[PDB]
Write a protein that binds this ligand. Structure first.
Ligand SMILES: *[C@@H]1O[C@H](CO)[C@@H](O[C@@H]2O[C@H](CO)[C@@H](O[C@@H]3O[C@H](CO)[C@@H](O)[C@H](O[C@H]4O[C@H](CO)[C@@H](O)[C@H](O)[C@@H]4O)[C@@H]3O)[C@H](O)[C@H]2NC(C)=O)[C@H](O)[C@H]1NC(C)=O
Ligand code: NAG
Ligand code: NAG
Ligand code: NAG
Ligand code: NAG
Ligand code: NAG
Ligand code: NAG
Ligand code: CL
Lengths: 222, 340, 208
């Protein structure tokens, strides 16, 4: 069966270069072109170019010429790509694709029935940083709201639970947002009976694996 | 009365028992003598659709040329990545001779005599023949060498010009000689010569034809963007040697002075990437002595840059398509049909 | 080029989605589906032909330059974003998301002043929560001493809650500790279909 196997995602700094691989299997590699496509969230998908494993001939979109290099290793059926002078504009998920129709006689490149799992690439100047966690303290009908503010971490993602997962109902963990500083921020709130605040203790379980920071923040009425 | 069909064709040539050149010999074995008296019957008020991009005849020639290269261009060693095999490295005397392709009983070949037929669509002037004209299996990249010529004016061939992954074939209506020499006595330093005046003139015409098929946008040429030397360079076999010529100069935008003779720097290689499939072949060191091939450029292979949108410009680069395209550039006007 | 519409599409399971694509060049047109966090899947090519494993529910049609992809009887798997493609060119995408219909519910509104721990760090975030509301459209209005704050905050909204089918929104206004201590009255004004009139939650700096 046709399978495109991609190397994982990565975090670059602006100015650097990135390299990705894509090993094809289940078919005759020389039969038809390999493509590289980038998809940035809420942005029109961009075809970067194609490579014909036979001879290694290439075709680059005007936009990328001089920055991108596509090659292959015919023996291992692996396609390679490099992108130089990265800018934030380059942040995206990078895919390799192959057309549906691909025989010895001929092909049709542009019906992408086969895709790699994708390689998510973020380019920014932020360095991996663990979140400082601040309380969102409740205040005195029968329900009170409270949470933790998880601010200034990079990169995504962070996970948040309550009282070690013992508390699930009422929990609202919002999508992170990217601040103008390059660091992420998100909030996690929960509603509870405002009569529990007196006795019931509420804890914030924050886990940010990328920085190995694990915080148990106790939230209490102020 | 008839229908489109594939089948096993046989070859015909003018190969002579006395000639010992390798291609000639292969033919004395594979083919039969060319028909002494050809018969071309014009088919009255008839119309037929051709598609050179899907012509099974191309596949059959392919298998022959692979057969031909297996007994005429056997390398000293083959590196298939998985193994490295040694084998006899016979001296090679190779000079392609015209090969005719013919149909067996119950079938027949159809020929399109429209003087500006670009390779796809209906043909008005149709005739019936038992064999193609003699076609030479010349293996080369970027430039199509020693082929037939357009009978009217320059013709742009493509399965679909708006599809950048489809090969473009230009068919000159007036050949241009390319004189290639490697002096005797670095025994790799070779060069090629072309008349700048004749060449550049032919460029004006092709680009003017190209512009015609792209809603009058500025046509500009650029060197290849990457890939193996077989692809980024004009590559061909001369007197058993493998030439590799830099074509930057032929596609000079400004020249479209520029009247004199332009000379390409070529290099001869002993280690090459085999076209028949995958792996590197190793041929012996260059023999001593002056080596000189004079060929006729009759067609060009182009790839259009993709992802334009804005502009205003269309950018073409020499090469590359596929080796089967060389045969297509000659088989374009023929198709096999079956009686009943 | 390829102009795809609409940008977004909020529909319930069972309904039919009609995504549109306008071309100018023509030639085999294809549609892709991308599920949250997964690689796109070819859905249709040649404008009208289904790929392998694509059920009858997906169908495409054409009229001149205009191309439609139609998804009937929506179900969980169908939601995501869809792209039209012509050779190397793609459309801007259409996000198709799930909105299960329910009775209108007004937001519960809470405002949170910055914690002392954060102020010690020399920065201040004011948070306004809009909890469990329907439908999804809602407006947040920051005011600092009666001055309207335009472009000084960031919003984030949850996907529709699986249990009660409501939405929740969080708005964060960030300021320098120095700026925060310049002003006194911090207000959050919420307007929604469930509110007969806009609701303003507020507080004065430094008041327990
Ligand atoms: C494009 O086609 C042209 C002709 O259409 C073709 O040019 C021809 O090349 C062949 C081979 O290079 C030439 O034939 C030669 O003639 C000379 C004598 O004048 C011989 O020296 C050559 O080799 C002889 O000696 C060799 C010693 O090893 C023997 O191996 C060999 O069998 C011969 O005995 C050879 O016979 C022919 O003269 C030219 N014709 C012209 C008009 O120049 C050219 O090769 C084609 N280009 C490509 C890329 O195929
Ligand atoms: C068919 O060909 C015959 C043979 O010449 C010719 O007389 C006749 O006009 C043609 N019919 C048409 C419709 O052209
Ligand atoms: C070939 O010629 C006709 C137009 O006269 C038609 O099949 C098609 O438009 C042409 N194709 C090219 C590449 O010129
Ligand atoms: C080649 O074709 C061009 C049109 O593309 C024409 O102007 C020129 O005269 C032709 N050359 C010959 C020798 O017919
Ligand atoms: C090929 O070039 C050589 C070296 O310039 C020259 O002597 C010879 O005349 C040329 N051949 C032809 C046919 O012009
Ligand atoms: C051909 O020559 C040009 C100009 O001399 C040079 O820049 C380029 O590297 C060469 N191209 C190849 C493919 O060797
Ligand atoms: C095609 O899109 C048009 C644009 O609104 C719409 O009216 C029509 O219903 C769509 N066709 C299908 C089959 O969805
Ligand atoms: Cl294609």
């Amino acid at each position: 069966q046709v399978r495109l196997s991609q190397s994982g995602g990565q975090m670059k700094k602006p100015g650097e270069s990135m390299r990705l691989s894509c090993r094809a299997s289940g078919y005759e590699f020389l039969n038809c072109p390999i493509n590289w496509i980038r998809l940035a969230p809420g942005r029109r998908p961009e075809w970067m170019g194609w490579l014909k494993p036979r001879g290694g001939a290439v075709n680059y979109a005007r936009k990328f010429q001089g920055r991108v290099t596509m090659t292959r290793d015919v023996y291992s059926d692996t396609a390679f790509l490099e992108l130089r002078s990265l800018t934030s504009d380059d942040t995206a998920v990078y895919f390799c694709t192959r057309g549906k129709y691909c025989t010895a006689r001929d092909y049709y490149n542009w019906d992408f029935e086969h895709w790699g799992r994708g390689a998510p690439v973020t380019v920014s100047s932020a360095s991996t940083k663990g979140p400082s966690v601040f309380p969102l303290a409740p205040s005195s009908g029968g329900t009170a709201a409270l949470g933790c503010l998880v601010k200034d971490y990079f990169p995504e993602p962070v996970t948040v639970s309550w009282n070690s997962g013992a508390l699930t109902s009422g929990v609202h963990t919002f999508p992170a947002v990217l601040q103008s500083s390059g660091l992420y921020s998100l909030s996690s709130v929960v509603t509870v009976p405002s009569s529990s605040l007196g006795t019931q203790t509420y804890i914030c379980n924050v886990n940010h694996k990328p920085s190995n920071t694990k915080v148990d923040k106790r939230v209490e009425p102020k | 009365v008839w229908k489109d069909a594939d089948t096993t064709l046989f070859c015909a040539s003018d190969a002579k028992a006395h000639e010992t050149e390798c291609h000639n010999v292969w033919a004395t074995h594979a083919c039969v003598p060319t028909d002494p008296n050809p018969q071309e019957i014009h088919l009255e008020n008839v119309t037929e659709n051709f598609n050179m991009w899907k012509n099974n005849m191309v596949e059959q020639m392919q298998e022959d040329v692979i057969s031909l290269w297996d007994q005429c261009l056997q390398p000293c060693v083959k590196l298939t990545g998985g193994s490295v095999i040694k084998q006899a490295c016979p001296k090679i005397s190779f000079d392609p001779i015209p090969i005719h392709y013919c149909t067996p009983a119950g079938y027949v070949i159809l020929k399109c005599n429209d003087k500006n037929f670009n390779g796809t669509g209906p043909c008005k002037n149709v005739s019936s023949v038992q064999c193609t004209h003699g076609i030479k299996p010349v293996v080369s990249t970027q430039l199509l060498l020693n082929g037939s010529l357009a009978e009217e004016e320059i013709i742009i061939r493509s399965e679909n010009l708006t599809n950048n992954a489809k090969t473009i074939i230009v068919h000159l209506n007036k050949s241009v000689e390319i004189n290639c020499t490697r002096p005797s006595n670095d025994i790799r330093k070779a060069y090629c010569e072309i008349n700048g005046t004749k060449w550049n003139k032919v460029l004006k015409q092709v680009t003017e034809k190209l512009k015609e098929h792209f809603n009058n946008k500025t046509i500009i040429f650029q060197p290849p963007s990457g890939g193996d030397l077989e692809i980024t360079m004009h590559h061909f076999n001369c007197r058993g040697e493998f030439f590799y010529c830099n074509t930057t100069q032929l596609f000079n935008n400004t020249c479209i002075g520029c009247n004199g003779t332009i000379t390409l720097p070529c290099k001869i290689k002993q280690i090459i990437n085999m076209w028949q499939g995958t792996g590197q072949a190793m041929y012996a060191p260059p023999i001593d002595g002056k080596i000189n091939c004079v060929s006729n450029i009759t067609g060009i292979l182009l790839t259009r840059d993709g992802g334009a949108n804005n502009t205003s410009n269309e950018t073409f680069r020499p090469g590359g398509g596929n080796i089967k395209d060389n045969w297509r550039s000659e088989l374009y006007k023929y198709k096999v049909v079956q009686i009943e | 080029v390829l102009t795809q519409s609409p940008a977004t599409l909020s529909l319930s399971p069972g309904e039919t989605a009609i995504i549109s694509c306008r071309t100018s060049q023509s030639g085999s047109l294809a549609w892709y589906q991308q599920r949250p966090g997964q690689a796109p899947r070819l859905v249709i090519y040649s404008g009208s032909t289904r790929a392998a494993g694509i059920p009858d529910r997906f169908s495409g049609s054409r009229w001149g330059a205009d191309y439609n992809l139609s998804i009937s009887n929506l179900e969980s798997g169908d939601f995501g974003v869809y792209y039209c493609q012509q050779y190397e060119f793609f459309g801007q995408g259409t996000k198709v998301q799930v909105d299960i219909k329910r009775t209108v519910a007004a937001p519960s509104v809470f405002i949170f002043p910055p914690s002392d721990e954060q102020l010690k760090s020399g920065t201040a975030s004011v948070v306004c929560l809009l909890n469990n509301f329907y439908p999804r459209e809602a407006k947040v209005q920051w005011k600092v001493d009666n001055a309207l704050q335009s472009g000084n905050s960031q919003e984030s909204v949850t996907e529709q809650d699986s249990k009660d089918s409501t939405y929740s929104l969080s708005s964060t206004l960030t300021l320098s500790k120095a700026d925060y201590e310049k002003h006194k009255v911090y207000a959050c004004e919420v307007t929604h279909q469930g509110l007969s009139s806009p609701v303003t939650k507020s507080f004065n700096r430094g008041e327990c």
